[PDB]
Structure 1
Amino acid sequence: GPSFWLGNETLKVPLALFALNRQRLCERLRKNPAVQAGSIVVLQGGEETQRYCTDTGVLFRQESFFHWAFGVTEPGCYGVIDVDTGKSTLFVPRLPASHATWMGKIHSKEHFKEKYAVDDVQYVDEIASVLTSQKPSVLLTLRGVNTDSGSVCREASFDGISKFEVNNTILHPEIVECQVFKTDMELEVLRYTNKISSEAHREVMKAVKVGMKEYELESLFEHYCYSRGGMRHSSYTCICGSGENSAVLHYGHAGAPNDRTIQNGDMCLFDMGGEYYCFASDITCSFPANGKFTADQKAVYEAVLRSSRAVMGAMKPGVWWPDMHRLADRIHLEELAHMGILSGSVDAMVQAHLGAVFMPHGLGHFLGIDVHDVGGYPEGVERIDEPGLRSLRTARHLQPGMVLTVEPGIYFIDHLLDEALADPARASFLNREVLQRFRGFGGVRIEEDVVVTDSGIELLTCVPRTVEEIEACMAGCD
Structure 2
Amino acid sequence: GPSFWLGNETLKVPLALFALNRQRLCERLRKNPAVQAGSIVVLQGGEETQRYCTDTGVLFRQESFFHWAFGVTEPGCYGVIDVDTGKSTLFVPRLPASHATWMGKIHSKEHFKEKYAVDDVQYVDEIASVLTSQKPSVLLTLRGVNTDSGSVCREASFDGISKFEVNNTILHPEIVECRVFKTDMELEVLRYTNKIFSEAHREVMKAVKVGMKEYELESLFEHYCYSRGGMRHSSICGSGENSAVLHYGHAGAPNDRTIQNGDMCLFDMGGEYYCFASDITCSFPANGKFTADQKAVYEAVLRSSRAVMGAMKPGVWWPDMHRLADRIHLEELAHMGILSGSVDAMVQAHLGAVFMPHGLGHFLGIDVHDVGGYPEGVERIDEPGLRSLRTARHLQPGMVLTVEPGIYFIDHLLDEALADPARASFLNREVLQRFRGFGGVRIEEDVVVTDSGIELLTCVPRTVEEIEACMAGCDKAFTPF
> Does the alignment reach a TM-score above 0.5?
yes
Structure 2 Cα separation of the partners of residues 219 and 164 of structure 1: 50
What secondary structure does 2:278 align onto?
A: coil
Note the C-alpha offset of 1:154: 1.1
Q: Deviations over 1:129-181 (max 9, x none)?
A: 00000000000000000000000111000000000000000000000000000
Q: Deviations over 1:411-461 (max 9, x none)?
A: 000000000000000000000000000000000000000000000000000
What secondary structure does 1:232 align onto?
A: coil
Q: Deviations over 1:360-402 (max 9, x none)?
A: 0000000000000000000000000000000000000000000
**1:339 maps to which of 312, 332, 336:** 336
**Counterpart check, 1:38 vs 2:13:** no
Structure 1 Cα separation of the partners of residues 201 and 412 of structure 2: 31
Note the C-alpha offset of 1:407: 0.1
Structure 2 Cα separation of the partners of residues 337 and 58 of structure 1: 49
The 5 Å alignment of 1:310-389 reads: 310-389=307-386
Structure 1 Cα separation of the partners of residues 133 and 159 of structure 2: 16
Q: Residue in 2 aligned with 1:129? A: 129
Q: Deviations over 1:76-104 (max 9, x none)?
A: 00000000000000000000000000000
Structure 1 Cα separation of the partners of residues 274 and 48 of structure 2: 17
Structure 2 Cα separation of the partners of residues 16 and 72 of structure 1: 13
Note the C-alpha offset of 1:304: 0.1
Structure 2 Cα separation of the partners of residues 378 and 309 of structure 1: 28
Note the C-alpha offset of 1:274: 2.7
Q: Residue in 1 aligned with 2:297? A: 300
Note the C-alpha offset of 1:331: 0.1
* Aligned partners of 1:241 and 1:270 also within 8 Å: yes
Q: Across the two proteins, how many residue pairs are aligned to each other?
A: 475
Unpaired segments ≥5 residues, structure 2 = 476-481
The 5 Å alignment of 1:452-463 reads: 452-463=449-460
Structure 2 Cα separation of the partners of residues 172 and 220 of structure 1: 39
Structure 2 Cα separation of the partners of residues 60 and 234 of structure 1: 14
* Aligned partners of 1:79 and 1:91 also within 8 Å: yes
Note the C-alpha offset of 1:59: 1.1
* Aligned partners of 1:194 and 1:281 also within 8 Å: yes
Structure 1 Cα separation of the partners of residues 232 and 462 of structure 2: 27
Structure 2 Cα separation of the partners of residues 273 and 247 of structure 1: 18
Structure 1 Cα separation of the partners of residues 224 and 125 of structure 2: 41
* Aligned partners of 1:270 and 1:284 also within 8 Å: yes
Structure 2 Cα separation of the partners of residues 274 and 53 of structure 1: 28
* Aligned partners of 1:330 and 1:355 also within 8 Å: yes
Structure 2 Cα separation of the partners of residues 373 and 207 of structure 1: 31
Structure 1 Cα separation of the partners of residues 232 and 433 of structure 2: 43
What secondary structure does 2:162 align onto?
A: helix
Unpaired segments ≥5 residues, structure 1 = none
**1:261 maps to which of 258, 263, 268:** 258
TM-score, normalized by length of structure 1? 0.99
Structure 1 Cα separation of the partners of residues 240 and 392 of structure 2: 32
* Aligned partners of 1:79 and 1:88 also within 8 Å: yes
Structure 2 Cα separation of the partners of residues 18 and 400 of structure 1: 20
Structure 1 Cα separation of the partners of residues 403 and 255 of structure 2: 24
Structure 1 Cα separation of the partners of residues 445 and 183 of structure 2: 20
Q: Deviations over 1:31-69 (max 9, x none)?
A: 000000000000000000000110001110000000000
Q: Deviations over 1:247-290 (max 9, x none)?
A: 00010010001010000000000000331000000000000000
Structure 2 Cα separation of the partners of residues 453 and 234 of structure 1: 28
Structure 2 Cα separation of the partners of residues 58 and 390 of structure 1: 34
Structure 1 Cα separation of the partners of residues 89 and 402 of structure 2: 35
Structure 1 Cα separation of the partners of residues 357 and 270 of structure 2: 22
Structure 1 Cα separation of the partners of residues 459 and 429 of structure 2: 38
Q: Percent of aligned positions with the same letter in both sequences?
A: 100
What secondary structure does 1:400 align onto?
A: coil
* Aligned partners of 1:222 and 1:274 also within 8 Å: no
Q: Residue in 2 aligned with 1:176? A: 176
Q: Deviations over 1:14-34 (max 9, x none)?
A: 000000000000000000000
Q: Please tell me the root mean square deviation across aligned C-alpha atoms, in Å.
A: 0.4
Structure 1 Cα separation of the partners of residues 406 and 13 of structure 2: 34
Structure 1 Cα separation of the partners of residues 172 and 391 of structure 2: 17
Note the C-alpha offset of 1:462: 0.3
Runs of 4+ in structure 1 off by over 2 angstroms are none
TM-score, normalized by length of structure 2? 0.99
* Aligned partners of 1:2 and 1:115 also within 8 Å: yes
Note the C-alpha offset of 1:234: 1.9
What secondary structure does 1:281 align onto?
A: strand
* Aligned partners of 1:367 and 1:373 also within 8 Å: yes
**1:398 maps to which of 395, 407, 419:** 395
Q: Deviations over 1:296-354 (max 9, x none)?
A: 00000000000000000000000000000000000000000000000000000000000
* Aligned partners of 1:405 and 1:447 also within 8 Å: yes
Q: Residue in 2 aligned with 1:449? A: 446
What secondary structure does 2:178 align onto?
A: helix
* Aligned partners of 1:200 and 1:221 also within 8 Å: yes
What secondary structure does 1:152 align onto?
A: coil
Note the C-alpha offset of 1:471: 0.2
Structure 1 Cα separation of the partners of residues 470 and 11 of structure 2: 26
Structure 1 Cα separation of the partners of residues 246 and 206 of structure 2: 23
Structure 2 Cα separation of the partners of residues 466 and 274 of structure 1: 25
Q: Deviations over 1:188-238 (max 9, x none)?
A: 000000000000000000000000000001100111000000011026xxx
Structure 1 Cα separation of the partners of residues 204 and 132 of structure 2: 55
What secondary structure does 1:335 align onto?
A: helix
Structure 2 Cα separation of the partners of residues 274 and 33 of structure 1: 38
Structure 2 Cα separation of the partners of residues 154 and 195 of structure 1: 33
* Aligned partners of 1:44 and 1:156 also within 8 Å: yes
